[PDB]
Design a binder for this molecule. Structure first.
Ligand SMILES: *[C@@H](N)c1ccccn1
Lengths: 236, 178
């Protein structure tokens, strides 16, 4: 991650990230909305970080330090490049929408009035199909990925060394290989919770309510299709 | 240290997320209660043993019967939650949750946890429940269900006041260690 974005999302909430002279000028209902929107963006930043740990630290390091066949590595990290592209793009639109909304003279005071449209975009059309297929693929390969990790760990002492090396920093305490795989699989099921709690504080403007309602339907439909498309692959 | 995995299962709004959050921060957060929990790795010392305990939620996964089980591989202990203000959340323990957990994870210890025990002494909740001709779960209905499902034990806590939370996760650690 990049220091600028990590700094902007370091606080436990919107209400603590902005200056309090700015907070006081807003209604409670606005603050509660913004808090959840901030949480959506913060957890999306964390999700992209996870995928970058997977592509750059784990996968590339395996290719460039060990010299495992690319087929084994592809079994451990299926589809990560494509997931990385999906989520990095979604993140850049979220962060762009926050930046457009900053007060002149401020790098931290903002209010996002329109999120619905951007969520509708992400979760419909070509972008929604790419998510359905990539998550159907990844979630079907999830179990195989864990077994392959454990096989390699138990058998190859150099593999163990590599893992113990790259996961030694405190900041990777929660981000071992298996953790990463589950963090990703669980991401998609977070979106309806976040979106509903946003929607519950977004009644003030009727168009936003309708946009968020549409987004929620679209997410649940994507989750529904991904769930029908899954069958665990096996090996040994 | 030794590494163990814990998963919390149970019905949506039985307080799964709130409980994980209150334990992991060690505070009922005063300003904002997150909507979601990612994961967390607790440093716990119990009975002189040091363990790294990875915490996982199943919140959001309740309607997705092929996604949810991907949470289960290599679990060492299950916290199976219901809400004391919700007798229906307890009816579903043996119907839905127990058969699933035992299918995927047949010899993993299950601790049955009654959340929101604070609500047992709450005017609003007693009244709301009286309208569908019910009352808060009694401690003996809890113990009876735990006995029936073959749980390792039964515990109560309240994430709001933090009473009982530390004890749940210390006991989960002990159970994971057998
Ligand atoms: C549960 N402990 C479980 C599920 C699948 C594989 C192994 N264990």
């Amino acid at each position: 991650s990049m220091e600028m974005d990590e700094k902007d999302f370091a606080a436990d909430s919107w209400s603590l990230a902005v200056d309090s002279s700015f907070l006081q000028q807003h209604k409670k209902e606005v603050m509660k909305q913004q808090d959840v929107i901030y949480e959506l963006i913060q957890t999306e930043l964390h999700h992209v970080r996870t995928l970058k740990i997977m592509t750059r630290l784990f996968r590339t390091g395996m290719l460039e330090e060990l010299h495992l066949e690319p087929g084994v590595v592809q079994g451990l990290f299926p589809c990560v490049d494509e997931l990385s592209d999906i989520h990095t793009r979604f993140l850049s639109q979220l962060l762009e929408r926050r930046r457009q909304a900053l007060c002149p003279g401020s790098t931290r005071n903002f209010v996002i009035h329109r999120l619905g449209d951007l969520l509708i975009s992400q979760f419909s059309g070509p972008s929604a199909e790419q998510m359905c297929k990539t998550y159907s693929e990844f979630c079907s390969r999830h179990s195989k990925a864990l077994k392959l990790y454990k096989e390699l760990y138990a058998r190859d002492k150099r593999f163990q060394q590599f893992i113990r090396k790259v996961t030694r920093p405190a900041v990777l305490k929660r981000h071992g290989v298996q953790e990463c795989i589950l963090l990703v699989t669980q991401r998609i099921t977070k979106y309806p919770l976040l979106i509903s709690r946003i929607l519950q504080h977004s009644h003030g403007i009727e168009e936003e309510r309708q946009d968020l309602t549409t987004a929620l339907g679209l997410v649940k439909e994507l989750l529904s299709n991904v769930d029908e498309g899954i069958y665990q692959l096996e090996k040994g | 240290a030794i590494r163990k995995k814990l998963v919390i299962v149970g019905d949506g709004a039985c307080g799964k997320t709130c409980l994980l959050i209150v334990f992991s921060k060690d505070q009922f957060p005063e300003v904002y209660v997150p909507t979601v929990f990612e994961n967390y790795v607790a440093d716990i010392e119990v009975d002189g043993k040091q363990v790294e305990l990875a915490l996982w939620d199943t919140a959001g996964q309740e309607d997705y019967d092929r996604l949810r089980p991907l949470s289960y591989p290599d679990t060492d202990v299950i916290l199976m939650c219901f809400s004391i203000d919700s007798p229906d959340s307890l009816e579903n323990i043996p119907e839905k949750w127990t058969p699933e957990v035992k299918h995927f994870c047949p010899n993993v210890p299950i601790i049955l946890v009654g959340n929101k025990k604070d609500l047992r002494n709450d005017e609003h909740t007693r009244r709301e429940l009286a309208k569908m001709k019910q009352e808060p779960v009694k401690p003996e209905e809890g113990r009876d269900m735990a006995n029936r499902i073959g749980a390792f034990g039964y515990m109560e806590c309240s994430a709001k006041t933090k009473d009982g939370v530390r004890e749940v996760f210390e006991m989960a650690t002990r159970a994971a260690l057998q």
